[PDB]
């Protein structure tokens, strides 16, 4: 599958792509405002994620830090990033279908649209000003709006027992972005696409 990753934000982001135990394609790249990065993701990839990182500093060897979404200090991510991170999530070619979603379960840093570029399904978007409206106790100093599990580490927010309900904090994310997962047992907002679809992830789709 082909993913085109587009930065429509007025600021630079460092895109990342990983399936948790390996990079997808190069794993990460700087995207100045307006730049596009095309990557190739192997068919059958399960549990892939794409996200943006903000305010990064990398040396010549590709080592450094980011204020949101840092993946162990590497430019080219092999593992998932530090919250807060708006997540584009996908599993490809699962019994003939692709499954895509946007998730706020690990917080929110950058607005995002995640859409197919081929026929057969719809896209999803979370583009509200979640950072501006973020409850005080979830605000991340580096930028972004943390999820409640990251901040408070309770069974209820992290859904550790497999039983949990919505919370004041999850309802905040759900109000501003109904089409994104707001907690682990949220009613799924997953979209089913034809197997082997292609996609575009756009950061700051409205601005």
PDB file of C-alpha atoms in Angstrom:
ATOM      1  CA  UNK A   1       0.000   0.000   0.000  1.00  0.00           C
ATOM      2  CA  UNK A   2       0.972   3.571  -0.686  1.00  0.00           C
ATOM      3  CA  UNK A   3       0.513   6.290   1.932  1.00  0.00           C
ATOM      4  CA  UNK A   4       1.009   9.926   1.045  1.00  0.00           C
ATOM      5  CA  UNK A   5       1.738  11.966   4.176  1.00  0.00           C
ATOM      6  CA  UNK A   6       1.130  15.688   3.724  1.00  0.00           C
ATOM      7  CA  UNK A   7       1.963  18.504   6.112  1.00  0.00           C
ATOM      8  CA  UNK A   8      -0.561  21.315   5.603  1.00  0.00           C
ATOM      9  CA  UNK A   9       0.395  22.873   8.985  1.00  0.00           C
ATOM     10  CA  UNK A  10       2.110  26.260   8.965  1.00  0.00           C
ATOM     11  CA  UNK A  11       4.848  24.712  11.114  1.00  0.00           C
ATOM     12  CA  UNK A  12       7.355  21.919  10.484  1.00  0.00           C
ATOM     13  CA  UNK A  13       6.463  18.446  11.730  1.00  0.00           C
ATOM     14  CA  UNK A  14       8.480  15.253  11.808  1.00  0.00           C
ATOM     15  CA  UNK A  15       6.266  12.473  10.530  1.00  0.00           C
ATOM     16  CA  UNK A  16       6.692   8.972  11.944  1.00  0.00           C
ATOM     17  CA  UNK A  17       5.482   5.565  10.793  1.00  0.00           C
ATOM     18  CA  UNK A  18       5.892   2.342  12.763  1.00  0.00           C
ATOM     19  CA  UNK A  19       4.234  -0.953  13.618  1.00  0.00           C
ATOM     20  CA  UNK A  20       5.640  -0.941  17.139  1.00  0.00           C
ATOM     21  CA  UNK A  21       8.560  -3.324  16.693  1.00  0.00           C
ATOM     22  CA  UNK A  22       9.792  -1.978  13.354  1.00  0.00           C
ATOM     23  CA  UNK A  23       9.826   1.119  11.177  1.00  0.00           C
ATOM     24  CA  UNK A  24       7.422   1.355   8.263  1.00  0.00           C
ATOM     25  CA  UNK A  25       9.415   2.454   5.220  1.00  0.00           C
ATOM     26  CA  UNK A  26      12.088   4.895   6.482  1.00  0.00           C
ATOM     27  CA  UNK A  27      10.237   5.345   9.782  1.00  0.00           C
ATOM     28  CA  UNK A  28      10.389   9.120   9.925  1.00  0.00           C
ATOM     29  CA  UNK A  29      11.153  12.315   8.075  1.00  0.00           C
ATOM     30  CA  UNK A  30      11.050  16.072   8.415  1.00  0.00           C
ATOM     31  CA  UNK A  31       8.112  17.707   6.610  1.00  0.00           C
ATOM     32  CA  UNK A  32       8.233  21.437   6.173  1.00  0.00           C
ATOM     33  CA  UNK A  33       4.950  23.246   5.624  1.00  0.00           C
ATOM     34  CA  UNK A  34       3.416  21.954   2.393  1.00  0.00           C
ATOM     35  CA  UNK A  35       5.754  18.995   1.905  1.00  0.00           C
ATOM     36  CA  UNK A  36       4.559  15.499   0.997  1.00  0.00           C
ATOM     37  CA  UNK A  37       6.200  12.176   1.807  1.00  0.00           C
ATOM     38  CA  UNK A  38       5.193   9.010  -0.004  1.00  0.00           C
ATOM     39  CA  UNK A  39       5.823   5.718   1.762  1.00  0.00           C
ATOM     40  CA  UNK A  40       5.199   2.086   0.961  1.00  0.00           C
ATOM     41  CA  UNK A  41       3.683  -0.172   3.586  1.00  0.00           C
ATOM     42  CA  UNK A  42       3.817  -3.942   3.084  1.00  0.00           C
ATOM     43  CA  UNK A  43       0.491  -5.707   2.484  1.00  0.00           C
ATOM     44  CA  UNK A  44      -0.757  -7.535   5.564  1.00  0.00           C
ATOM     45  CA  UNK A  45       0.708  -4.993   7.974  1.00  0.00           C
ATOM     46  CA  UNK A  46      -1.203  -5.223  11.220  1.00  0.00           C
ATOM     47  CA  UNK A  47      -1.218  -2.482  13.836  1.00  0.00           C
ATOM     48  CA  UNK A  48       0.568   0.227  11.897  1.00  0.00           C
ATOM     49  CA  UNK A  49       0.469   3.843  13.086  1.00  0.00           C
ATOM     50  CA  UNK A  50       1.375   7.209  11.593  1.00  0.00           C
ATOM     51  CA  UNK A  51       1.754  10.360  13.685  1.00  0.00           C
ATOM     52  CA  UNK A  52       3.359  13.790  13.750  1.00  0.00           C
ATOM     53  CA  UNK A  53       6.096  14.958  16.128  1.00  0.00           C
ATOM     54  CA  UNK A  54       6.553  18.609  17.015  1.00  0.00           C
ATOM     55  CA  UNK A  55       9.527  20.750  18.060  1.00  0.00           C
ATOM     56  CA  UNK A  56      12.266  18.264  17.260  1.00  0.00           C
ATOM     57  CA  UNK A  57      16.042  18.675  17.304  1.00  0.00           C
ATOM     58  CA  UNK A  58      18.158  16.010  15.573  1.00  0.00           C
ATOM     59  CA  UNK A  59      21.892  15.816  14.997  1.00  0.00           C
ATOM     60  CA  UNK A  60      23.667  14.484  11.905  1.00  0.00           C
ATOM     61  CA  UNK A  61      23.244  10.883  13.085  1.00  0.00           C
ATOM     62  CA  UNK A  62      19.456  11.194  13.394  1.00  0.00           C
ATOM     63  CA  UNK A  63      19.458  11.292  17.181  1.00  0.00           C
ATOM     64  CA  UNK A  64      17.706  13.906  19.255  1.00  0.00           C
ATOM     65  CA  UNK A  65      14.439  14.777  20.911  1.00  0.00           C
ATOM     66  CA  UNK A  66      10.900  15.973  20.161  1.00  0.00           C
ATOM     67  CA  UNK A  67       8.426  17.665  22.502  1.00  0.00           C
ATOM     68  CA  UNK A  68       5.562  15.473  21.345  1.00  0.00           C
ATOM     69  CA  UNK A  69       5.620  11.991  19.904  1.00  0.00           C
ATOM     70  CA  UNK A  70       9.294  11.246  20.548  1.00  0.00           C
ATOM     71  CA  UNK A  71      10.216   7.651  19.652  1.00  0.00           C
ATOM     72  CA  UNK A  72      13.267   6.966  21.807  1.00  0.00           C
ATOM     73  CA  UNK A  73      15.130   9.967  20.425  1.00  0.00           C
ATOM     74  CA  UNK A  74      15.362   8.752  16.818  1.00  0.00           C
ATOM     75  CA  UNK A  75      14.493  10.529  13.592  1.00  0.00           C
ATOM     76  CA  UNK A  76      13.621   7.201  11.996  1.00  0.00           C
ATOM     77  CA  UNK A  77      11.117   5.622  14.393  1.00  0.00           C
ATOM     78  CA  UNK A  78      11.226   1.908  15.107  1.00  0.00           C
ATOM     79  CA  UNK A  79       8.839   2.091  18.058  1.00  0.00           C
ATOM     80  CA  UNK A  80       5.716   4.077  18.930  1.00  0.00           C
ATOM     81  CA  UNK A  81       5.919   7.663  20.150  1.00  0.00           C
ATOM     82  CA  UNK A  82       5.513   9.340  23.512  1.00  0.00           C
ATOM     83  CA  UNK A  83       2.056  10.853  24.162  1.00  0.00           C
ATOM     84  CA  UNK A  84       0.446  13.172  23.350  1.00  0.00           C
ATOM     85  CA  UNK A  85       0.021  11.916  19.781  1.00  0.00           C
ATOM     86  CA  UNK A  86      -2.979  12.045  17.474  1.00  0.00           C
ATOM     87  CA  UNK A  87      -2.822   8.595  15.787  1.00  0.00           C
ATOM     88  CA  UNK A  88      -3.687   7.347  12.327  1.00  0.00           C
ATOM     89  CA  UNK A  89      -4.084   3.564  12.807  1.00  0.00           C
ATOM     90  CA  UNK A  90      -4.413   0.832  10.238  1.00  0.00           C
ATOM     91  CA  UNK A  91      -4.417  -2.886   9.625  1.00  0.00           C
ATOM     92  CA  UNK A  92      -4.139  -3.940   6.000  1.00  0.00           C
ATOM     93  CA  UNK A  93      -5.372  -7.019   4.124  1.00  0.00           C
ATOM     94  CA  UNK A  94      -7.136  -8.605   7.064  1.00  0.00           C
ATOM     95  CA  UNK A  95      -9.306 -11.304   5.487  1.00  0.00           C
ATOM     96  CA  UNK A  96      -9.808  -9.188   2.384  1.00  0.00           C
ATOM     97  CA  UNK A  97     -10.335  -5.804   4.031  1.00  0.00           C
ATOM     98  CA  UNK A  98      -8.362  -2.814   5.311  1.00  0.00           C
ATOM     99  CA  UNK A  99      -9.309  -1.197   8.613  1.00  0.00           C
ATOM    100  CA  UNK A 100      -8.484   2.419   9.407  1.00  0.00           C
ATOM    101  CA  UNK A 101      -9.205   4.825  12.257  1.00  0.00           C
ATOM    102  CA  UNK A 102      -8.044   7.925  14.060  1.00  0.00           C
ATOM    103  CA  UNK A 103      -7.442   7.628  17.782  1.00  0.00           C
ATOM    104  CA  UNK A 104      -7.148  10.089  20.673  1.00  0.00           C
ATOM    105  CA  UNK A 105      -6.500   7.274  23.165  1.00  0.00           C
ATOM    106  CA  UNK A 106      -2.887   8.502  23.446  1.00  0.00           C
ATOM    107  CA  UNK A 107      -3.890  12.171  23.423  1.00  0.00           C
ATOM    108  CA  UNK A 108      -3.799  14.799  20.716  1.00  0.00           C
ATOM    109  CA  UNK A 109      -1.021  16.986  19.351  1.00  0.00           C
ATOM    110  CA  UNK A 110      -1.771  17.828  15.689  1.00  0.00           C
ATOM    111  CA  UNK A 111      -5.098  17.826  13.780  1.00  0.00           C
ATOM    112  CA  UNK A 112      -5.381  15.085  11.176  1.00  0.00           C
ATOM    113  CA  UNK A 113      -7.373  13.790   8.220  1.00  0.00           C
ATOM    114  CA  UNK A 114      -6.974  10.112   7.221  1.00  0.00           C
ATOM    115  CA  UNK A 115      -8.592   9.307   3.859  1.00  0.00           C
ATOM    116  CA  UNK A 116      -8.397   6.693   1.119  1.00  0.00           C
ATOM    117  CA  UNK A 117      -7.073   7.870  -2.271  1.00  0.00           C
ATOM    118  CA  UNK A 118      -8.725   4.890  -3.956  1.00  0.00           C
ATOM    119  CA  UNK A 119     -12.400   3.877  -4.246  1.00  0.00           C
ATOM    120  CA  UNK A 120     -14.723   2.186  -1.794  1.00  0.00           C
ATOM    121  CA  UNK A 121     -14.789   3.864   1.628  1.00  0.00           C
ATOM    122  CA  UNK A 122     -14.802   7.202   3.438  1.00  0.00           C
ATOM    123  CA  UNK A 123     -12.149   9.020   5.419  1.00  0.00           C
ATOM    124  CA  UNK A 124     -12.111  10.212   9.012  1.00  0.00           C
ATOM    125  CA  UNK A 125     -10.931  13.462  10.511  1.00  0.00           C
ATOM    126  CA  UNK A 126     -10.147  15.043  13.851  1.00  0.00           C
ATOM    127  CA  UNK A 127      -9.485  18.735  13.233  1.00  0.00           C
ATOM    128  CA  UNK A 128     -10.950  20.553  16.222  1.00  0.00           C
ATOM    129  CA  UNK A 129      -8.837  22.801  18.447  1.00  0.00           C
ATOM    130  CA  UNK A 130      -8.292  20.165  21.114  1.00  0.00           C
ATOM    131  CA  UNK A 131      -5.063  21.743  22.347  1.00  0.00           C
ATOM    132  CA  UNK A 132      -6.699  25.162  22.843  1.00  0.00           C
ATOM    133  CA  UNK A 133      -9.704  23.708  24.672  1.00  0.00           C
ATOM    134  CA  UNK A 134      -7.743  21.062  26.615  1.00  0.00           C
ATOM    135  CA  UNK A 135      -8.747  20.687  30.293  1.00  0.00           C
ATOM    136  CA  UNK A 136      -6.092  22.136  32.597  1.00  0.00           C
ATOM    137  CA  UNK A 137      -5.124  18.806  34.153  1.00  0.00           C
ATOM    138  CA  UNK A 138      -4.486  17.230  30.714  1.00  0.00           C
ATOM    139  CA  UNK A 139      -2.388  20.027  29.206  1.00  0.00           C
ATOM    140  CA  UNK A 140       1.120  18.953  28.238  1.00  0.00           C
ATOM    141  CA  UNK A 141       3.801  21.650  28.767  1.00  0.00           C
ATOM    142  CA  UNK A 142       5.625  20.616  25.594  1.00  0.00           C
ATOM    143  CA  UNK A 143       2.417  21.138  23.716  1.00  0.00           C
ATOM    144  CA  UNK A 144      -0.557  18.931  23.185  1.00  0.00           C
ATOM    145  CA  UNK A 145      -3.372  17.470  25.240  1.00  0.00           C
ATOM    146  CA  UNK A 146      -2.684  14.226  27.104  1.00  0.00           C
ATOM    147  CA  UNK A 147      -5.159  11.424  27.536  1.00  0.00           C
ATOM    148  CA  UNK A 148      -6.276  10.677  31.115  1.00  0.00           C
ATOM    149  CA  UNK A 149      -4.572   7.272  31.241  1.00  0.00           C
ATOM    150  CA  UNK A 150      -1.169   8.840  30.551  1.00  0.00           C
ATOM    151  CA  UNK A 151      -1.708  11.493  33.212  1.00  0.00           C
ATOM    152  CA  UNK A 152      -3.409   9.567  36.052  1.00  0.00           C
ATOM    153  CA  UNK A 153      -2.510   5.886  35.498  1.00  0.00           C
ATOM    154  CA  UNK A 154      -5.751   4.438  36.904  1.00  0.00           C
ATOM    155  CA  UNK A 155      -7.487   1.213  35.952  1.00  0.00           C
ATOM    156  CA  UNK A 156     -10.562   3.191  34.875  1.00  0.00           C
ATOM    157  CA  UNK A 157      -8.770   5.559  32.455  1.00  0.00           C
ATOM    158  CA  UNK A 158      -6.429   2.850  31.122  1.00  0.00           C
ATOM    159  CA  UNK A 159      -9.200   0.198  30.985  1.00  0.00           C
ATOM    160  CA  UNK A 160      -6.814  -2.289  32.564  1.00  0.00           C
ATOM    161  CA  UNK A 161      -9.492  -4.770  33.634  1.00  0.00           C
ATOM    162  CA  UNK A 162     -11.236  -4.676  30.257  1.00  0.00           C
ATOM    163  CA  UNK A 163     -14.139  -3.054  32.013  1.00  0.00           C
ATOM    164  CA  UNK A 164     -14.286   0.683  31.942  1.00  0.00           C
ATOM    165  CA  UNK A 165     -16.732   3.397  30.994  1.00  0.00           C
ATOM    166  CA  UNK A 166     -16.475   6.827  29.401  1.00  0.00           C
ATOM    167  CA  UNK A 167     -15.156   9.542  31.709  1.00  0.00           C
ATOM    168  CA  UNK A 168     -15.275  13.329  31.942  1.00  0.00           C
ATOM    169  CA  UNK A 169     -11.924  13.360  30.157  1.00  0.00           C
ATOM    170  CA  UNK A 170     -12.824  10.914  27.365  1.00  0.00           C
ATOM    171  CA  UNK A 171     -16.076  12.829  26.749  1.00  0.00           C
ATOM    172  CA  UNK A 172     -14.040  15.970  26.145  1.00  0.00           C
ATOM    173  CA  UNK A 173     -12.139  14.323  23.268  1.00  0.00           C
ATOM    174  CA  UNK A 174     -15.345  12.724  21.960  1.00  0.00           C
ATOM    175  CA  UNK A 175     -17.252  16.027  21.937  1.00  0.00           C
ATOM    176  CA  UNK A 176     -14.598  17.744  19.836  1.00  0.00           C
ATOM    177  CA  UNK A 177     -13.845  14.719  17.617  1.00  0.00           C
ATOM    178  CA  UNK A 178     -16.716  12.238  17.457  1.00  0.00           C
ATOM    179  CA  UNK A 179     -15.084  10.206  14.697  1.00  0.00           C
ATOM    180  CA  UNK A 180     -11.956   9.350  16.724  1.00  0.00           C
ATOM    181  CA  UNK A 181     -11.551   6.773  19.510  1.00  0.00           C
ATOM    182  CA  UNK A 182     -11.733   8.592  22.852  1.00  0.00           C
ATOM    183  CA  UNK A 183     -11.057   5.669  25.228  1.00  0.00           C
ATOM    184  CA  UNK A 184     -10.262   1.979  24.890  1.00  0.00           C
ATOM    185  CA  UNK A 185     -13.842   0.677  24.850  1.00  0.00           C
ATOM    186  CA  UNK A 186     -15.347   3.496  22.833  1.00  0.00           C
ATOM    187  CA  UNK A 187     -17.915   2.480  20.232  1.00  0.00           C
ATOM    188  CA  UNK A 188     -15.620   1.757  17.281  1.00  0.00           C
ATOM    189  CA  UNK A 189     -15.173   4.456  14.668  1.00  0.00           C
ATOM    190  CA  UNK A 190     -13.176   2.126  12.465  1.00  0.00           C
ATOM    191  CA  UNK A 191     -13.757   2.379   8.716  1.00  0.00           C
ATOM    192  CA  UNK A 192     -13.694  -0.739   6.550  1.00  0.00           C
ATOM    193  CA  UNK A 193     -12.001  -0.259   3.180  1.00  0.00           C
ATOM    194  CA  UNK A 194     -11.326  -2.671   0.326  1.00  0.00           C
ATOM    195  CA  UNK A 195      -8.145  -4.684   0.831  1.00  0.00           C
ATOM    196  CA  UNK A 196      -5.068  -3.031  -0.714  1.00  0.00           C
ATOM    197  CA  UNK A 197      -6.479   0.500  -0.735  1.00  0.00           C
ATOM    198  CA  UNK A 198      -4.117   3.499  -0.796  1.00  0.00           C
ATOM    199  CA  UNK A 199      -4.295   6.439   1.607  1.00  0.00           C
ATOM    200  CA  UNK A 200      -3.418  10.022   2.399  1.00  0.00           C
ATOM    201  CA  UNK A 201      -2.714  11.335   5.896  1.00  0.00           C
ATOM    202  CA  UNK A 202      -2.950  15.147   6.050  1.00  0.00           C
ATOM    203  CA  UNK A 203      -1.739  17.095   9.084  1.00  0.00           C
ATOM    204  CA  UNK A 204      -3.714  20.331   9.701  1.00  0.00           C
ATOM    205  CA  UNK A 205      -6.284  19.532   7.002  1.00  0.00           C
ATOM    206  CA  UNK A 206      -8.276  22.741   7.507  1.00  0.00           C
ATOM    207  CA  UNK A 207      -5.451  25.213   8.178  1.00  0.00           C
TER     208      UNK A 207
END
